[PDB]
Write a protein that binds this ligand. Sequence first.
Ligand SMILES: Cc1cc2nc3c(=O)[nH]c(=O)nc-3n(C[C@H](O)[C@H](O)[C@H](O)COP(=O)(O)O)c2cc1C
Ligand code: SF4
Ligand code: SF4
Ligand code: SF4
Ligand code: FES
Ligand code: FES
Ligand SMILES: [K+]
Lengths: 263, 214, 44, 432
Amino acid sequence: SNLIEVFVDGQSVMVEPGTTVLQACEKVGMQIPRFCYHERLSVAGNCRMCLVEIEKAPKVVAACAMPVMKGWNILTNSEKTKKAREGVMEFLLANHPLDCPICDQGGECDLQDQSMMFGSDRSRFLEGKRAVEDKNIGPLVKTIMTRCIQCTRCIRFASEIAGVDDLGTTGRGNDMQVGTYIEKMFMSELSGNIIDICPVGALTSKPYAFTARPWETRKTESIDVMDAVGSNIVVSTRTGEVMRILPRMHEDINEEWISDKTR
Amino acid sequence: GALFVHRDTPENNPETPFDFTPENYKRIEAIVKNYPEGHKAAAVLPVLDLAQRQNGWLPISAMNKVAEILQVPPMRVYEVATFYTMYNRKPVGKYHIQVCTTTPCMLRNSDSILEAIQKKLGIKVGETTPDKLFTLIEVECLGACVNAPMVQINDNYYEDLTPKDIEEIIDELKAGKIPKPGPRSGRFSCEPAGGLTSLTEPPKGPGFGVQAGL
Amino acid sequence: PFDNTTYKNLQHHDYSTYTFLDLNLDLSKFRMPQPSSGRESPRH
Amino acid sequence: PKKTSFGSLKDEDRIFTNLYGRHDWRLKGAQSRGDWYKTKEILLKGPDWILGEVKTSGLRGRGGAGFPTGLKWSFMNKPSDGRPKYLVVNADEGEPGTCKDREIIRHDPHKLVEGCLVGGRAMGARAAYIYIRGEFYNEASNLQVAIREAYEAGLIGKNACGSGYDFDVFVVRGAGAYICGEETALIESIEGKQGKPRLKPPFPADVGVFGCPTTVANVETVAVSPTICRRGGAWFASFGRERNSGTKLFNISGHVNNPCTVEEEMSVPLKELIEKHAGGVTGGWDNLLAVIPGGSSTPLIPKSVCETVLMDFDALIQAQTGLGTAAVIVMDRSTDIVKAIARLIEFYKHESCGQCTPCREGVDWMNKVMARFVRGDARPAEIDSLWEISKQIEGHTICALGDGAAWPVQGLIRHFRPELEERMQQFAQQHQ
Ligand SMILES: Cc1cc2nc3c(=O)[nH]c(=O)nc-3n(C[C@H](O)[C@H](O)[C@H](O)COP(=O)(O)O)c2cc1C
Ligand code: SF4
Ligand code: SF4
Ligand code: SF4
Ligand code: FES
Ligand code: FES
Ligand SMILES: [K+]
């Protein structure tokens, strides 16, 4: 009886208090676009890709952080929402490098895919782009930080999931940089997971580099035997060869993580 | 410096000697007691600033020492050090000249002030004199816009400046004397030049105009 | 004795590097005891 | 009855009677001018009476946003759970053109300290943290000296003013960041992190500094509250148009004969303010090009609008700008208006905290476009492009800094579009 009634494009849904606008849309099968939000990390609210119009509210709200209020009608497809997404996608791509052919994320990139589904089809950015130094954080995770979109998922993962506080942001404004400041290796038994959570090609698997494209791999859902946890995994193969190991969600075992030995 | 990554050098590495003096350790104690227990991290900014006052600038060893004293991860101290512009992560000159070039000061010819300083010291913006006595940088609004054009040297504002005035100030500094701060034009603070347009009557005393019932 | 013609904020001409923190150290004895969150830090 | 012309504020009705620092700023001088008078009675009147006085005065935030103070401070008027409650005084003062709060801190520090006590009592706060920008070192030391005098006179600390209420006043210095004036970024800085604003909700009155109920109030808003209590909300509400009440500190800078800080009535004509107090526009009123009426974040207005506009929140909203902090920046006809605004965009580019996408990338983008507009190295189609970019930043960011960087661009395009196109024409012809 604590549930409240809210609407997603006019369809009633009953949600418990504290549910965010983004979670309310999930219940009716609508996935709000996102970059910074991850359901297993602390809310950040910085990418602004989840902005959505509330009926009768002049200002768009960050669906990932805004608690839904009784009677709200969330318009996930209004011109106001669509123009907010196009504007944000435009800002994300202004300084992003033209790297898709040489970038391992290509073909399974949330920036590529959400640009196609929610962004414009052309550029009006007529300036030069930012370029960033690369950081060395060990032999497992390659960094191409010019591709970073400053979503801070890796920072929140390292702090909250891995319990390591080596990743942060240095500088301010457009020159704000994710990294370790000093020369430091992010060696944790869970370090490899920051490859998966990073939505772009900024963080990629060094062992996997350049070997395959996502569309050409075959997925075999399997189990890890590197320890006794029994982590669920996907074995990626191509033309009869194992290419990489990825996590497979299992809420009651490994959630969506795996150890570095498993990976 | 201009970069926000740290590379160790002989002059700046984890082994570069830094420690708080016994007197600064007493100041740190009073700093830390201004905040609730369980929230010592609130003291990072003032303690980091204290390390810079003792040392002049912040070597990476000083950042590590602050992180150790307050028991916060060192990375959370690097973020503060690189976020805030008053922390010097490279050595600066004895006198850090900071010229405001934002629009209100630009409208009153802050450029002529900047051009005068460069000529007298023979350096460019962002340089240190070979004496290591002066470092020159441009800054954003310093909160003295009605007294433009103005500069800050260390903790002191010098205001209502002309090219002659800033040159006189630098000569005093080069001669080992700290000049008086404040406007150099004739007025004392923020009053309009050429007489007060307000607050010319003696201020009223206690209880003037008090409402009934108090 | 109403002189509205001199600047009476000249004390700061004699301030030094540790003036602010010396005053904070001096003020330390006048403060109320701080509240507590119940633990040494959010990482405890 | 309902006066329709405003201005000509008399000295007896001025709150900041040591604005120019020509009298003693320490406790003895402050008490001679009426500070700390009957403060015990005010505190014993209780939080509800104090908040009622503030509501009746019609006081609005002096920090730049202008929310009704009485309603804002009443968010704290609620029973205490386990957590302490705090008043945070915003003395960051970073908006270009604004220097009013500096004068209060160094010349009327005891007005601020007493305001912390009265305001803190009204909110039920145990302590006040005064966040002062790091560059205001000498001002901070003056404030610290005044706080010590208050502690030694029993006015603050245990049993403040003999009222039985315990209150502390702490001073915390910033380290160089305009974004730390933003209320939630200010809280994050006090907590020892980068000054990156928080999203809302929660609001500070629910979750603030150290996660506790908090109210962030501007220095000027806090400093007038003891007087509003002593002389009554009705007295303060008798100044200015309705819903724009009280006196206001104005900074006049730029191309005026006598740039100065002055206290004047709310709703005073802008032209009268410049002429009476600032000694007129350099070269006469006919030499005026444009005015930024409320600091860098408010859109500029051209001379034609400046002839008749009043200086208050509602009047300037009608002129498609805002009162802001009431920092009037005057530009005469010799000014390169495009370069003047381009410099403000460069200020916001240097001050963006970088947290959220539209400002981190958008403001930097606008800075690059404005730099080419100054040289004319652009084409007219890019003007409407720049307009749309500013609308993609505005209303899509975490904090209002993004809005404050978009508004100056919109004001330039709105009122000086032919100047932009003229310069583009010059560059094409000269290069071709
Ligand atoms: C970028 C930015 C800078 C700000 N700087 C200040 C400031 O220096 N002083 C201030 O009082 N408010 C500043 N504000 C406004 C505060 O966020 C807040 O609205 C104000 O402190 C509330 O106090 P008030 O209601 O008494 O005005 C700033 C806001 C932004 C977005
Ligand atoms: S991160 Fe995505 S959009 Fe960027 S270069 Fe790689 S594949 Fe292309
Ligand atoms: S490296 Fe990847 S996960 Fe980390 S902030 Fe950048 S885009 Fe986000
Ligand atoms: S609008 Fe700019 S200053 Fe404000 S939170 Fe976003 S990036 Fe930071
Ligand atoms: S997903 Fe909500 S702001 Fe990034
Ligand atoms: S613009 Fe220079 S002090 Fe404000
Ligand atoms: K990735």
